[PDB]
Design a protein around this ligand. Structure first.
Ligand SMILES: O=P(O)(O[C@@H]1[C@@H](O)[C@H](O)[C@@H](CO)O[C@H]1O)O[C@@H]1[C@@H](O)[C@H](O)[C@@H](CO)O[C@@H]1O
Ligand code: NA
Ligand code: NA
Length: 491
């Protein structure tokens, strides 16, 4: 009797294992299959889906012991989708050296250590009591455990499969259970009638890949999808022209960017990276494609960071003439530089690129698009410029300047950014320092090096736009996920 929900999506994640699926496409699926110890109550106090309040979820109760540990008292009688009782053994395994942050774990869960704080091994005190802690002071543990790092996995089942096989047949405690997946096509979930919280309101949820937004909007209009993702503010005119459809959007805690393969000779030094950055007139892109709804950050700095947000920081300058000078100095010889984009996987990716191509022409640089189809992974050696995004997944400046751009992490190790020694020393400091002036001072210097080095160019915080049938009552949240608990009803 419950209605079946059909969501037209931009893509599917590479895995449904909670960490390996961290992407713009994963959380919207992963958040239904799993629960964390702590959950973000996005709509608390009438908030329009952007409240940061963290509430009990698989942890019935929790108390901070000191500056580096929290005791969690677990909800009793919670079952995983395979009938198994969720216990402290499962929570300890989820945040253990074996599964997440140990040397052997990061070979199969590659960002398990990169994204984690300085964990120490969890302590199981009893069946429903577990202490989670860091070796060094950290007032961010609650924030990590309520983020996309937090989903609790079943110990026996996950171990008997391994992270990647688990990622294709996930088992969690969440309100929807995995039914099936067809690679690069769809994922279907079904109501978990054993759920401990709000009873699921959809019989099934199907995430159907419709890579082209043009076809996705047409599918919504023709009655094929109840909700569609990854639209732009300019899609309002077509969608809202229909009385039974509407767009629903919000500013999300994500950053659209372009970055470089710094192993490539032309981008080994900061000179052309900075030239590409200074040639971009971001207010003009935000006015032309985002209806002035996207936000331009003032450095690698967001109000979401709270105590480590710097409101007085000046934004990076649009400086066409200086970009011209930097191009000439760099030795650039007019060779075409490619910019790889998987179509409009990122909302406004292709129109923003075309506007930046004209801005780059004005600076004396030839950039050409290299639009690749879904399921056609280009090799790193073929990449010069590429687009990317970073979810700003903690209310703290550590994510993602440190979690992505820090020492030993992907931008330096895979994409070859030669960060100054000073940057890597300060990344290590902000992880071990408690909230304060020294931590803020270190983030100020890290942001100055980041702006000077330009390993990536921050475009804007997107205004994420969805569209839906007016009979589907659901509000977007300020993050790259979809929340349906207490937020999905039909009629
Ligand atoms: O959707 P994305 O912008 O990037 C995804 C990537 O995560 C995924 O593995 C890949 C193949 O499926 O497709 C995209 O490049 O996700 C980023 C993620 O890469 C990053 O780790 C995270 C935190 O910075 O932010 C996401 O927004
Ligand atoms: Na060249
Ligand atoms: Na949402």
């Amino acid at each position: 009797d419950r209605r079946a929900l059909r969501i037209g999506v931009n893509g599917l994640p590479p895995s449904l294992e909670p960490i390996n699926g961290i992407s713009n496409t994963g959380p919207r699926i992963i958040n239904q299959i799993f629960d964390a110890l702590i959950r973000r109550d996005y709509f608390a106090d009438g908030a329009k889906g952007n409240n940061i309040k963290l509430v009990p979820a698989l942890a019935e109760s929790f108390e901070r012991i000191d500056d580096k540990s929290i005791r969690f008292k677990l909800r009793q009688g919670v079952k995983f989708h395979n009938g198994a009782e969720m216990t402290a053994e499962d929570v300890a395994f989820t945040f253990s050296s074996e599964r997440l942050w140990g040397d052997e774990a990061i070979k199969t869960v590659p960002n398990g250590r990169n994204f984690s704080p300085n964990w120490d091994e969890p302590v199981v005190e009893d069946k429903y009591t577990v202490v989670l802690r860091t070796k060094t002071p950290s007032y961010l543990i609650e924030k990590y455990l309520g983020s996309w790092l937090g989903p609790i996995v079943p110990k026996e089942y996950y171990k008997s499969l391994g992270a990647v096989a688990f990622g294709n047949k996930p088992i969690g405690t969440g309100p929807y259970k995995f039914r099936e997946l067809v690679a690069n096509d769809h994922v279907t979930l079904e109501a978990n009638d054993g759920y401990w919280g709000d009873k699921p309101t959809a019989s099934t949820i199907t995430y159907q890949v419709v890579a082209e937004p043009a076809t996705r909007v047409a599918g919504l209009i023709s009655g094929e999808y109840d909700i569609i993702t990854t639209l732009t503010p300019d899609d309002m005119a077509l969608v809202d022209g229909y009385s039974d459809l509407e767009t629903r959007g919000t500013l999300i805690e994500n950053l659209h960017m372009f970055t470089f393969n710094m192993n490539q000779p032309i981008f080994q030094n900061k000179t052309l990276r900075r030239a590409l950055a200074l040639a971009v007139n971001r207010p003009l892109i935000v006015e032309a494609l985002w209806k002035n709804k996207a936000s331009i950050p003032n450095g690698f700095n967001f109000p979401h960071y709270g105590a480590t947000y710097d409101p007085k920081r000046k934004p990076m300058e649009f400086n066409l003439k200086e970009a011209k000078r930097l191009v000439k100095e760099s030795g650039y010889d007019g060779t075409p530089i490619t910019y790889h984009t998987m179509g409009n996987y990122y909302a406004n990716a292709v129109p923003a690129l075309m506007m930046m191509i004209e801005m780059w022409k004005a600076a004396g640089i030839t950039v050409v698009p290299k639009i690749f189809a879904p399921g056609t992974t280009p090799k790193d050696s073929d990449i010069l410029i590429r687009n990317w995004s970073n979810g700003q997944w903690l209310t703290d400046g550590l994510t993602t300047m440190v979690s992505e751009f820090g020492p030993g992490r992907g931008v330096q190790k895979r994409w070859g950014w030669k960060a100054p020694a000073e940057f890597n020393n300060l990344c290590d400091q902000v992880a071990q320092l408690k909230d304060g002036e020294e931590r803020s001072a270190a983030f100020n210097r890290l942001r100055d090096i980041f702006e000077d080095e330009a390993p990536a160019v921050l475009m804007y915080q997107p205004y994420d736009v969805y569209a839906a049938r007016k009979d589907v009552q659901w509000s977007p949240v300020s993050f790259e996920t979809m929340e349906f608990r207490g937020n999905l009803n039909f009629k």
